[PDB]
């Protein structure tokens, strides 16, 4: 059980509780459901590297209370 | 409140972003802008479109043949005119409800009482000593101080808001925060002889040292590096980098030797990006809404990084 | 009518899959443009009544509308003409759980699946979420008259 922090472009701080061996697709789906936007528009990257569905925290070496950055694509201007 | 129907109609898009109260705070603020070059032109355009009470464009230099043919504020054939006078018509046409003024006097000769009428002073293409003097004057009289520059693919932005109080939306709504800034004499002369200082240097972007080198170059030659003198200016820039980074007890190696290929002339996209960032910082400081960035912002056009640094404390 | 590339490719693949193998009696063909071509984003469907049910013997025409968000958004299905059913709006729009993205709709589910779901809802409705307030009324009050009306409607729509 590793605690993860996901912050958006507007510094929307939301905590997550995920397992060591589970894939991160569940985290993306849960964040998409909670924020009300489909996960396709959002991109989650770890230390500047995009997180794929098949990635796991062990592959990326995540530690307790770590930060995940999510960037929503804007349709306007 | 005091916002007219036409004002609301033409400001609706930014009102919906940052509140009528912050719009009103913007409407009662006067900004002084020095160095109406490309970066100065971008900052002036953005501030006038934002809808400040007034903007005093100061520039003692005239339009020269070496300047770019198109300048977005100076009509073609205006060679020999004053830059502020040339750009005044277009700047005023940008927004009719903003009192855009022109000052052709030198910034050095301006007395301290001249700066008291403004609540925000922005400096562009100014020497280091002028920057220090103007920042000291602004800090003494409690005036927000900004300065920035563009050189090749690189740009920088500095802000000295003193003891700044603002309101920021709560994460969950209007909460109050206070941030303390530092003068230029402390930001540009940060000591690097401590373990914490060494770690910060390991984590500090190299654009700060490039800014120091180019400030020294402007202090020495009296002008920014020019494309037509690329070889001599590049050799002098390398020498200045060596001496400047040796005087601080730092290893010049962290600043790449090829930095001289991307710090020449002013570029329109770099001007646009840096002017937008600096104008947003000025608007945030004037409206006292949203946390202003740390005292330094650095932009790299080739790599695409915009890095905000806190140096001086 | 301007649709996205993924929506158009998915609709073409869906049409090919339907033409390759579809349940007997069901009809799902893209509508005809006034020019003479056929429109992939507008389908003229037809759902047969299930045998052994009061809806049997009738062919109920349905219209399928796809937007550019397809398949990320469900199609808008409506009966033309609107029929008498607790879960069908008076405007003809059919309210189904699988036809709404926030309730049950998934982008991987096919036109055949939703047509079969509409047929199943036709065979048996749900009352927790009615949409008619008249079919619902005479379904909850006395079922005999509801079955009589359903039989008359099915006879009216017999091909």
């Amino acid at each position: 059980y590793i605690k993860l922090k996901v912050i958006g472009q507007d510094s929307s701080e939301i905590h997550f509780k995920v397992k060591m061996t589970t894939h991160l697709k569940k985290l993306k789906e849960s964040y998409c459901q909670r924020q009300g936007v489909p996960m396709n528009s959002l991109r989650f990257l770890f230390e500047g590297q995009r997180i794929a569905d098949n990635h796991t925290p062990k592959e990326l070496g995540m530690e307790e209370e770590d930060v995940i950055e999510v960037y929503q694509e804007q349709t306007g201007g | 409140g005091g916002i007219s129907e036409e004002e609301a109609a033409q400001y609706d898009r930014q009102i919906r972003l940052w509140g009528l109260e912050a719009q009103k705070r913007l409407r009662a603020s006067r900004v002084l802008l020095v160095g109406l070059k490309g970066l100065g032109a971008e900052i002036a355009k953005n501030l006038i479109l934002a809808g400040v009470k007034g903007l005093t464009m100061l520039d003692h230099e005239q339009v020269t043949p070496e300047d770019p043919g198109a300048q977005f504020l100076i009509r073609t054939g205006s060679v020999g005119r004053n830059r502020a006078e040339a750009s005044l018509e277009r700047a005023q046409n940008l927004n009719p409800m903003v009192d855009v003024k022109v000052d052709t006097e030198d910034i050095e000769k301006k007395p301290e009482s001249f700066f008291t009428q403004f609540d925000a002073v922005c400096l562009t293409c100014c020497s280091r000593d002028v920057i220090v003097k103007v920042d000291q004057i602004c800090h003494k009289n409690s005036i927000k101080f900004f300065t920035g520059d563009v050189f090749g693919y690189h740009g920088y932005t500095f802000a000295n808001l003193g003891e700044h109080e603002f309101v920021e939306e709560k994460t969950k709504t209007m909460v109050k925060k206070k941030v303390v800034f530092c003068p230029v004499k402390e930001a540009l002369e940060v000591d690097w002889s401590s373990e914490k200082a060494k770690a910060a240097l390991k984590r500090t972007t190299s654009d700060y040292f490039l800014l120091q080198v180019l400030l020294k170059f402007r202090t020495d030659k009296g002008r920014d590096p020019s494309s037509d003198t690329y070889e001599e200016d590049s050799e002098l820039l390398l020498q200045i980098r060596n001496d400047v980074l040796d005087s601080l007890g730092i290893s010049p190696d962290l600043l790449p030797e090829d930095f001289v290929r991307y710090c020449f002339s002013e570029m329109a996209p770099v001007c646009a990006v840096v002017g937008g960032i600096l104008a947003q910082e000025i608007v945030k400081a004037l409206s006292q809404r949203d946390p202003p960035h740390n005292n330094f912002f650095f932009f790299d056009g080739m790599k695409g990084n915009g890095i905000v640094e806190c140096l001086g404390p | 009518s301007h649709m996205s590339g993924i929506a158009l490719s998915r609709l073409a693949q869906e049409r090919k899959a339907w033409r390759k193998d579809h349940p007997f009696g069901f009809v799902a063909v893209p509508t005809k443009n006034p020019d003479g071509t056929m429109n992939l984003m507008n389908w003229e469907c037809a759902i047969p009544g299930k045998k052994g049910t009061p809806w049997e013997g009738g062919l109920f025409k349905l219209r399928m509308l796809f937007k550019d968000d397809y398949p990320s958004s469900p199609p808008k299905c409506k009966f033309e003409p609107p029929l008498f059913h607790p879960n069908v709006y008076p405007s003809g729009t059919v309210c189904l759980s699988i036809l709404e993205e926030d309730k049950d709709w998934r982008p991987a589910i096919t036109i055949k699946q939703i047509l079969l779901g509409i047929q199943e809802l036709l065979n048996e409705p749900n009352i927790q979420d009615p949409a008619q307030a008249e079919a619902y009324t005479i379904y909850s009050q006395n079922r005999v008259e509801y079955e009589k009306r359903v039989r008359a409607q099915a006879k009216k729509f017999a091909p």
Binding site: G76 | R13, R16, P269, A272, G306 | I138
Partner: protein, 531 residues
Amino acid sequence: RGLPRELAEAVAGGRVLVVGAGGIGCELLKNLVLTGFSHIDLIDLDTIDVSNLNRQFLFQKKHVGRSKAQVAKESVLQFYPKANIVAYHDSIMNPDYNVEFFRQFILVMNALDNRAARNHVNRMCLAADVPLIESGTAGYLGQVTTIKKGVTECYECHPKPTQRTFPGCTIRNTPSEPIHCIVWAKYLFNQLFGEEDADQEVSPDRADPEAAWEPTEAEARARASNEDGDIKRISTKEWAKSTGYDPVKLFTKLFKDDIRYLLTMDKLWRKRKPPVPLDWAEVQSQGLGLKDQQVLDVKSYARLFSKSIETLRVHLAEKGDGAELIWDKDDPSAMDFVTSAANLRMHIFSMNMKSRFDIKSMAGNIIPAIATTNAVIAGLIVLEGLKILSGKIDQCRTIFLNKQPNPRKKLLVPCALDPPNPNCYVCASKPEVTVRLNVHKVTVLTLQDKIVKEKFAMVAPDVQIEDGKGTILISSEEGETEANNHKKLSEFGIRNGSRLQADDFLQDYTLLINILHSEDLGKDVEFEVVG
């Protein structure tokens, strides 16, 4: 100029296209002109509004009502006469801008605000094999990305919604959010005054004028009186037109009788608060910020509803041949109608009434915008274009603009461009044969048999004009598209530069065909493939 000589020549001789002349478009055009670009094509469909003067700087108060592209070109020519700006006052979705139009640009820059136009421009650039720079902006945020065929991801590799849809029953039966009431008001405006659309009919159709309830008690009389279909369910729009669009009867039908109609279904109000109908007489007799930011009482909103109904009825009567109205957020009467109806519906379902400011923000999908964000995004766009034109596509990155620095102290976050999705179906490589033939002198039957059935070896081909609307010309079914076999190819909009997709059932292989018009071919052959 600070550019290298090779890049200087590349940008001076090259021709670029800017689609969209908004705030981002204006900043991008100014930056391109200042950088050294001489041949720029600008296309925009809108006209200058007074709300555009916050972002757009090439437009003034005296330019309101004029074309955005022409005024932008004139403003750019004011400080740089040497610029060869070509302005189009049209939509990029127009068929005139085919692959032949997109093939003359060395770089295409997106400055749009909707996903549909972005999808069309992405498809056209992918077809024409022209690099595309895609950008967006919303408030303090924004991003810039590069799209290249076969190198980077396209706009459809990871599909995104174009607009948010709502459940059919939730909007009209069980609203739970103010946005539901707002979209209900918009759909009601379309139903009462706009064109026919069964998906926007939010008010149920029945015997309207009589105020009726307790159908459960009188179900026997109701079923004796009405047959299946309920006397064809007299249309609400027809009844409103017949009554003369009088505000009182419309108010009673929409906010009292319709709510009582909802209350008949007692099964879906067991776990939610039932709505409370409003009586017009009771509402009438019951007795800082901007003026649009003030929330009024239900009586003032009922009066506003009546006034808006009267004004819209007058407009409909004045309109020629009874043309249907189209909702516009900038129309005072339509905006008043939507605000009043949405607020009344919110009050009915026990929700907080919203000011006209918020109703306009949510109904019109207004995105906050400022000049600084657009300027930053345009500068990043021009930097990416300079990187592309110099052969440095490997150095191009997806740059994100943040409102506040991330924990890595990055206000601008560049990300490496991802490789294309192998299963995209949009940017995937497909055979792209091209044929040159007389469009006006060839039939659909000849296209199907002579040049597709046997020339390209297709047994059961179905053809589809890929104009973006998904219209298919030839169907492999033996009894579907035989009526237009003898019709000429020009009668379906096929012209020079039009491309049509052809896929086979048994052969399970597709093929793209590019049509090239040629009057001089010779009497021997009506078509000729081009290697």
